[PDB]
Design a binder for these strands. Structure first.
Length: 49
DNA sequence: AAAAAAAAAAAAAAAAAAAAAAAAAAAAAAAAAAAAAAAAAAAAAAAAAAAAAAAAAAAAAAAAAAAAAAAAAAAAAAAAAAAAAAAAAAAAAAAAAAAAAAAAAAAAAAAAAAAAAA
């Protein structure tokens, strides 16, 4: 897509754990995973960084 | 023959070092277990190969979570001042091969001496 290019990382997570992500240019963040709903292997949703 | 420096007399100031003996620790150098790594054998799971198949991307289309707009408000990060940590550049150095000067052994031959023959 215009926004999405290449799949990067896959992490298994429960419904109350956080996902910390990093960017190549000295940027990161810590997000709560409650606010995103599972979907069936075909879709694009929420931009977190 | 003039200048300069060493050394020695005797009361003063002030320092430095080598070993013995026992018992414990701390460096520092070795054999020797012990496991990576590598060479050279047989051996055996994976790709190949082929036929056969059915599970998920297309396609229609609603709708429901969404990313831009608007607003208010909090305050992370960036650049400018200073103040420390830590590493190349350059120069210096102590043993260390090279050279030169003095001590001990060497015999050739003779002065002086000691000793004895007729």
């Amino acid at each position: 897509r215009n926004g999405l290019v290449v799949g990067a990382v896959q992490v298994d997570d429960c419904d109350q754990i956080m996902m910390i992500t990093d960017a190549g240019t000295l940027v990161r963040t810590r997000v709560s995973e409650i606010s995103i709903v599972g979907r069936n292997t075909q879709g694009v949703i929420l931009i977190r960084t």
